[PDB]
Design a protein around this ligand. Structure first.
Ligand code: DTP
Ligand code: MN
Ligand code: MN
Length: 295
């Protein structure tokens, strides 16, 4: 089990994605090899699991809590954090990560807060959701415009493909605000963009509320909500991965799922050390009165 963080994998040959012949064992080995990459995000954050016992061709179970875990190393958080429910979950090691895969996990989504203080978010996320029949170029132009606004606000943003159909923008924040304050700020940004360019942006959820447009989703900022982790796999055809990218290579992207679990190695080799999010952990910023004025 040297290639699976010492974890025994049952039914190693069952297919996670028949389209590319990706087995459960391959998925486990991927999480073992890149555990450190995924842990850059999961190590100190509560995590929600997307489990697919029958592969992407079957259904998916979105799990937040668990009473009994057959995942050696997984951490069960204090029920007091979410009364009326079994313990939340936290993965802090390669063994726990692979163990989760062994139990059917395919995707990992983390909270916008870390164990240091789960009542003060350390980031907010803007998830751009486009109309299914909208040209990819629209997503690129919308992402560029969103970053321009963030620059004016004086906020540093970190971009990543979702692995699905849109882009994700993560903005770290000092733990000085409560959940409602951060969410309202994120919503204010979405509404601001919708007011400036109603032809491009929408601040209201629901496909019927973004026909031919892009919805700047701010709902992922609710306490308990989560967002797919950078470098994590998506339970979709081709097993695409959510990949951090430089703002300078944005216009060169051709799709939110251009990278997959098998092409990631090449991505990392091409980068050869260059890290799109090299300045993440070191970023120190907070919501200021000036920002509210601009919004
Ligand atoms: N297996 C799938 N194949 C195609 N579309 C999917 C699949 N699963 C989910 N979707 C679509 C339907 C959902 O309304 C939408 C939101 O996915 P979600 O993971 O919640 O946000 P996301 O940002 O991480 O991915 P996306 O870029 O697609 O929005 O994606
Ligand atoms: Mn989305
Ligand atoms: Mn969304």
């Amino acid at each position: 089990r040297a290639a699976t963080a010492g974890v025994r994998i049952s039914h190693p040959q069952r297919l996670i994605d028949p389209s590319i012949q990706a087995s459960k064992l391959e998925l486990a080995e991927f999480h073992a090899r890149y555990a450190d990459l995924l842990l850059r995000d999961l190590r100190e954050r509560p995590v929600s699991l997307v489990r697919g016992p029958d592969g992407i061709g079957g259904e998916l179970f979105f799990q937040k809590h668990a009473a009994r875990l057959k995942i050696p190393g997984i951490v069960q958080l204090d029920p007091a954090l979410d009364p009326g429910h079994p313990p939340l979950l936290q993965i802090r090691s390669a063994e726990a990560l692979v163990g989760a895969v062994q139990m059917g996990s395919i995707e990992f989504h983390t909270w916008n807060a870390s164990l240091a203080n789960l009542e003060r978010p350390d980031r907010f996320v803007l998830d751009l959701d486009p109309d299914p029949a909208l040209p990819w170029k629209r997503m690129l132009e919308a992402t560029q415009l969103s970053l321009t606004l963030l620059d004016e606000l004086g906020l540093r943003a970190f971009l990543k493909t979702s692995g699905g159909k849109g882009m994700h923008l993560l903005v770290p924040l000092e733990r000085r605000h409560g959940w409602d304050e951060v969410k309202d700020f994120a919503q204010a940004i979405s509404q601001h963009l919708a007011r400036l360019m109603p032809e491009r942006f929408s601040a209201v959820s629901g496909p019927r509320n973004r026909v031919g447009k892009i919805f700047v989703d701010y709902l992922r900022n609710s306490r308990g909500a989560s967002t797919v982790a950078a470098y994590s796999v998506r339970a979709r055809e081709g097993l695409p991965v959510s990949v951090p990218v430089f703002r300078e290579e944005l216009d060169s992207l051709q799709g939110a799922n251009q990278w997959n679990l098998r092409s990631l190695p090449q991505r990392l080799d091409e980068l050869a050390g260059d890290d799109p999010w090299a300045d993440y952990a070191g970023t120190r910023q907070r919501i200021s009165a000036a920002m509210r004025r601009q919004l």
